């Protein structure tokens, strides 16, 4: 029941780059129904993104190696590659389910709501990267519904230069380019947030400037590649 010891366990697991232990500690912290602090919010997000990130990187390598040897005519090998991709997919979907179930029932102050709603859209987007058929259509809807609800709260109570609001528009614009295959609508979300924030660049304290301008640079980097 020692909450602070579990948080310090997550800090240790991060320094040791053992993100499986870090995720389990923060999930245990979240399950105490106590509101997560700002640092504890990042600890949870960093842990689970690294856990799901290793599967996303492995899935891309296997999917690239599977679709490249499709004309090789080796079914004994092609089936083994396809079976591996499904194994990585099952791990990825299970990791996404753990976060989404934790957000809706424990997690999902307006800054926390936008942070958790962006995570919901992010992990539904990670599911949409591997899902197909009717399963792919329903995760896109749950990702769009989570991003849009976070966009509405961010536009009302958050200034355009807020790092959370800027980062939300980055992933929201990435969602429309890589999932929905809509380059124009993706450019609109990245250009509107960049323009709204750069118009008020003379508003940032001596600690958020490094963070706010970093995401603004990432928004323009995506806008350049999409034009």
């Amino acid at each position: 029941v020692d909450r602070e010891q579990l948080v310090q366990k997550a800090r240790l697991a991060e320094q040791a780059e053992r993100y499986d232990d870090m995720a389990a500690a923060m999930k245990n912290v979240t399950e105490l129904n106590e509101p997560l602090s700002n640092e504890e919010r990042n600890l949870l997000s960093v842990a689970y993104k690294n856990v799901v990130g290793a599967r996303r990187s492995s899935w891309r390598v296997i999917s690239s190696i599977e679709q490249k040897t499709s004309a090789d005519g080796n079914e004994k090998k092609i089936e083994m590659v396809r079976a591996y991709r499904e194994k990585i997919e099952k791990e990825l979907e299970a990791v996404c389910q753990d976060v989404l179930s934790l957000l809706d029932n424990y997690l999902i102050q307006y800054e926390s709501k936008v942070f958790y709603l962006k995570m919901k859209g992010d992990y539904y987007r990670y599911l949409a990267e591997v899902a197909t058929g009717e399963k792919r259509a329903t995760v896109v809807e749950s990702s769009e519904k989570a991003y849009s609800e976070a966009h509405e709260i961010s536009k009302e109570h958050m200034q355009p230069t807020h790092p959370i609001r800027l980062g939300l528009a980055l992933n929201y614009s990435v969602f429309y380019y890589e999932i929905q295959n809509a380059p124009e609508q993706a450019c609109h979300l990245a250009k509107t947030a960049f323009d709204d924030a750069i118009a008020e660049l003379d508003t940032l304290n001596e600690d958020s400037y490094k963070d706010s301008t970093l995401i603004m640079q990432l928004l323009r980097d995506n806008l350049t590649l999409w034009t």
Binding site: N42, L170, V174, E178, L218
Partner: peptide
């Protein structure tokens, strides 16, 4: 990928 927020 690699276009989303790195944190």
């Amino acid at each position: 990928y690699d276009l989303s927020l790195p944190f």
